[PDB]
């Protein structure tokens, strides 16, 4: 068979060396500060962060989105 | 303590059905009970006509398949316990017994 358009390539997740590492900040005294929000959904629970998009915050588990202006 | 017990017998084998009907009738008679029947309903003839060939070639020949169902009705004027005891007698395979009231 003959093909006109170039073959499509299936999506491959980009590799982040340490995505969790950048979600927390540790002070000298030992206090831990979270640089990203946590999803209020009960099912997601504590520890589940939401992406910091340039127009909103997105949760990867339940898909909840909060748009900020 | 007397009721009209309705007994419905269904089978594909006429001989077995008639033998079971006769056994039930004799059992009821031996107990001095009143027996009405057996009432033989019109025979149900399930008919299927299908083409013999598994393809479309050759003379179109057809197979006439029939499945005959025979039904009998027996009415007894007696009690549930006695009709149950009578129906407890051995029944050959292929005969379905149903006992109801009215």
């Amino acid at each position: 068979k003959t093909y006109t358009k170039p073959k499509k390539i299936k999506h491959k997740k980009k590799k982040v060396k340490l995505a969790v590492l950048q979600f927390y900040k540790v002070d000298d005294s030992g206090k831990v500060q979270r640089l990203r929000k946590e999803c209020p959904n009960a099912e997601c629970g504590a520890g589940t962060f939401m992406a910091n998009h340039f127009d909103r915050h997105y949760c990867g588990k339940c898909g909840l989105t909060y748009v900020y202006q | 303590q007397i009721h009209k017990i309705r007994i419905t017998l269904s089978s594909k084998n006429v001989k077995n059905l008639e033998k079971v009907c006769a056994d039930l009738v004799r059992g009821a008679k031996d107990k001095r009970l009143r027996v009405k029947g057996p009432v033989r309903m019109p025979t149900k003839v399930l008919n299927i006509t299908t083409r013999k060939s598994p393809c479309g070639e050759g003379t179109n020949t057809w197979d006439r398949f029939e499945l005959r169902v025979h039904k009998r009705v027996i009415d007894l004027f007696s009690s549930a316990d006695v009709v149950k005891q009578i129906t407890s007698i051995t029944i050959e395979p292929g005969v379905e017994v149903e006992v109801t009231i009215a």
Partner: protein, 55 residues
């Protein structure tokens, strides 16, 4: 495929909603009396089912 797309076409009726219970073919299905068997399979299994040829 995507859940909303894969096998999403309704199949509530028509030849595509029924198949032979013996071989799974969707053609020449005998639905009379609930047999749900294609004609070839029914002709093969008629004796076992209880269908006799008298005429």
């Amino acid at each position: 495929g995507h859940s909303n797309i894969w096998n999403a076409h309704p199949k509530n009726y028509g030849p595509g909603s029924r198949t032979c219970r013996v071989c799974g073919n969707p053609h020449a299905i005998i639905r009379k009396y609930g047999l749900m068997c294609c004609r070839q399979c029914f002709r093969s299994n008629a004796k076992e089912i209880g269908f006799i040829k008298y005429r």
